[PDB]
A paper describes a structure:
As a ‘half-transporter’ with only one NBD and one transmembrane domain (TMD) in a polypeptide chain, [name] forms a homodimer as a functional unit, similar to other determined ‘half-transporter’ ABCG structures including the human cholesterol transporter ABCG1 (hABCG1) and multidrug transporter ABCG2 (hABCG2)39–47. In this study, we determined the high-resolution structures of [name] in [name] in the apo, [name]-bound and ATP-bound states using cryogenic electron microscopy (cryo-EM) single particle analysis.
We also purified ABCG25WT protein with [name] extraction and [name] addition during the whole purification step, and finally determined an EM map with an overall resolution of 3.2 Å. The protein structure is almost identical to that determined with [name] plus CHS extraction, with an RMSD of 0.25 Å. A clear density was also observed in the identical site in protein sample prepared with [name] plus CHS, which can be docked by one [name] molecule with a better fitting density, further supporting the [name] binding site. The phenolic hydroxyl groups of Y565 form a hydrogen bond with the carboxylate group of [name], and Q413 interacts with the ketone group of the cyclohexene ring. In addition, as in the apo-state structure, Y565, Y564 and H434 seal the TMD to the extracellular space and form a gate for [name] release.
Author numbering:
A (entry chain A), B (entry chain C): 35 to 49, 81 to 325, 338 to 357, 377 to 601, 626 to 662
The structure:
Amino acid sequence: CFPITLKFVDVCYRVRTILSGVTGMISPGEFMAVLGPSGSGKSTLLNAVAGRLHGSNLTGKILINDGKITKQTLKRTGFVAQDDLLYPHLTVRETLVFVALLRLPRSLTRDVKLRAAESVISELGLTKCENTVVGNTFIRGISGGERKRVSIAHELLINPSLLVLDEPTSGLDATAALRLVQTLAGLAHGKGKTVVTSIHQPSSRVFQMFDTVLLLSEGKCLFVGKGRDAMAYFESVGFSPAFPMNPADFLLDLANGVCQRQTLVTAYDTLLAPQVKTCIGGITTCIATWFSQLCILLHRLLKERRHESFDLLRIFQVVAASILCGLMWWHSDYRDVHDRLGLLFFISIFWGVLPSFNAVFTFPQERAIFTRERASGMYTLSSYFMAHVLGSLSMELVLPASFLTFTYWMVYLRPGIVPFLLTLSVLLLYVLASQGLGLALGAAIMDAKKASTIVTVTMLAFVLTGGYYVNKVPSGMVWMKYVSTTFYCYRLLVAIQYGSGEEILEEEVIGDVGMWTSVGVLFLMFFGYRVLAYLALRRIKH
Amino acid sequence: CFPITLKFVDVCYRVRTILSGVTGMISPGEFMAVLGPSGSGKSTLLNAVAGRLHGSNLTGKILINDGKITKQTLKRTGFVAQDDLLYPHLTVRETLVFVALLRLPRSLTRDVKLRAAESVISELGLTKCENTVVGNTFIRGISGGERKRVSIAHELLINPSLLVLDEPTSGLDATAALRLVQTLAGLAHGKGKTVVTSIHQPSSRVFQMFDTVLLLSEGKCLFVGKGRDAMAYFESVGFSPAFPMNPADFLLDLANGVCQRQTLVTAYDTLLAPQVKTCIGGITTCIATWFSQLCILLHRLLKERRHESFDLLRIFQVVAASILCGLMWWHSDYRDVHDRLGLLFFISIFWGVLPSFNAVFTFPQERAIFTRERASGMYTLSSYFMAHVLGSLSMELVLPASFLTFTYWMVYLRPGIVPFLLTLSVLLLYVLASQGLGLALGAAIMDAKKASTIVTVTMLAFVLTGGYYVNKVPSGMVWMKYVSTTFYCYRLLVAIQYGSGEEILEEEVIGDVGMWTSVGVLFLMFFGYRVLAYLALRRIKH
Ligand SMILES: CC1=CC(=O)CC(C)(C)[C@@]1(O)/C=C/C(C)=C\C(=O)O
């Protein structure tokens, strides 16, 4: 009930000039294709007419519906990008319901907000595959011609009226590239939209689906016409095919100089180009809509935190370490101290290296998805950060709580329920204070290979200064132990099992720092590493 | 000076039947294309006519030059496969010289064996790019249209006369797919070869380069003719295009039933198919040619072992560990034993975990290249295995020999040159006996992710039983220490630094196993892990 008339009369985009003099207008109900050679600037004319390149070095009068490009007339414009950014473990129906709860406004009820994710299922051909998982090339899911049809459905929830795609039929085979163009011509004809696209190398019966074409040979345009008379035009200039050929291949051969392009630029500006020119509170509301954004993001990512934590090779490493501790220290005796202290220091190494090494892969693997979803009005950074914080400290407390229950009663540590719940609490605090070091380095580096070798050097300096290997620290590096997390875990485990002398009586048992000082620093390192992981994600200003 | 006439009259290939009734003959000097839909069995007719599918379920009379397919008439047949398997760090000229020394026979001199790798450089268009490295999508090297032109040059060194390619112009852009077909039509015309290929979706002026075509729609063939009269044939049956279209797109549309295929199969067998039927010592020699194969393989892989060992993130981890050992134990004193024993056990952990973790990535990353090169008469397994054994024990002795020289003289171990060359020898033997555990597990599993978690569990059981953490092993797992490599390294380092009492006098200093028993087991584990790594590569029978 509201059409749209795109009209651009612009001039060059100097980075060399990518575009130089292009022009043309698009009416409602008109499926248009923009085709040229590779590296000719057809990915820039689309990207600058949806409103994503402006200001610095782009001058022109790209005007939308006899007006001006505005934030008001930009919510009704969907730019389907070239690559697909989806979560693998979600199903196709769960993908489009979680997106529908974030894109659509909050004034609507939750009965039409998931009804409008149901008609988009049937408007495209996504009805047979609404229960299989999406997957990737690791997880066997939907086909490649349907992942593109989901990404088009991501942009049709907001009901746009100018849909600008960017090479849709690239990578698709011969019969899904035809069927995807057939349903895009149904949107422009049967619904009234203004679909604009750029096909790389169209086949012959894909070129019969177009209503308006546009050539681009390194800047300047050669033909802006209806498309059925693209061959009747070029024979008036003196060009014709010498053998039966695809019409989209002849006029794409004319663009890069191959004759059978100096006289094509000149004849356009004198015969065809001066013809289209003639047609020219907010207090208690912003709190409750913050927690509404957080409850949706904990349910999207719940299947992703479960695959990341409960991997079948991370279970085998904990099962294999829980039997070796239970067999080398089987039925230990408490009055030989040098063995009991080596049990309590292996636990501090093992649960400081595993939560901290696997946490550097969280943010580099999702920085391409996040920066697309953020600049679409779905969520800010403070609610995407607090869904990885709260979603990881609920799933990472399952394997160390099962390591210790199986081990504590075979290796014969202190009996009773009160020295067991103190050993469980110090261990689970040391797990949470140790993956914050992984989140702080993985978000300040943004490379999973350069940050996996700095977190290894960092946890090497925390082990050697933990107080077990070297006893006489050489008077210049005594400060090095007060910043290591392994030092504060190991001196708490010994204080629970032995206390302060009086029953074992070598003053490795008697500590030097304290009992409450060691737990007040592991909370300072728990909150202090999630702040420095947020200030490094704020630093990437888009 | 020896042409070849391929002639196949075969019947079905039942795995459902992929092929069912195809036939046809190819003359010398005739560039032929085999085109059909995806999943129609055009990758099987090529793969079975070069001589790579036979015996079990393939029956027919595929005969070469009025004869029979034989090992004699199979050296002159080059099957250029679909994917490219090249080493990245070699240049294009060094790639084709190392292959020319292996493919060509040994009776020739080494003046024409690299002259025949020089004319193949100029016969293809590989003259401008004969000095840039090959690379991959990690290392910036040659373009994608030239990596295919190197893989064609890999097969033209032996000078074939029947060149069978398999989708060459797949992934290439619009103007390198044309230029690659133009030089393949020059081999069939200007040299006299018999080029057979299968193009996926040819453009219009690529289809003008063909001399003979063949359609395949799920088994049976529809047209075997000259190609220029493929449109004059189908109008005699009653099919014609309704709009101007690529001729390779009309008759590929007829294959999968789309009309504008029941009457096409019937009309072929009655009108066109009964027309092509009417035309129907060794003792001292095998030693010296083993070492000649080994000297070529150490020079191919020398740039690959250098990138695998001297990576700039593996240098930083050794530099960062050599300063922490030199600063925590700076100017150590020899008469406090509990600190000196913790220096000697960290060294045993650090150089047992690093050579053994990085050795499991050697054989899984090169099993696709090796099984193609082996079944081409280039090398056997015993000379490919002894080039990874001898090429890795020369490059892995550089970082631990520089760790110990910087560390031994700051941490103040025993003075003199004779206790230093004993500490260097025990360490370098423990490095070589530890990567054999990586080569044994990485060649018995053939997966870099499943074998990286078993080598971590294995080196966890070797640390806890090494004799440092637990002193009183609980009487049932005392056997577990005699198979760990860390136990035999750590008890040798202590025996060099302290001897057997008499100057420090706690019997952790006095050993229990011996001085020569501990070095005779580290040679048994040095030779015993390269045998079990060869018997697991012999197990993959092609
Ligand atoms: C050998 C190994 C494999 C694992 O399972 C993880 C772990 C961290 C425990 C370890 O790296 C052990 C390291 C040890 C014991 C000490 C150290 O660092 O000085």
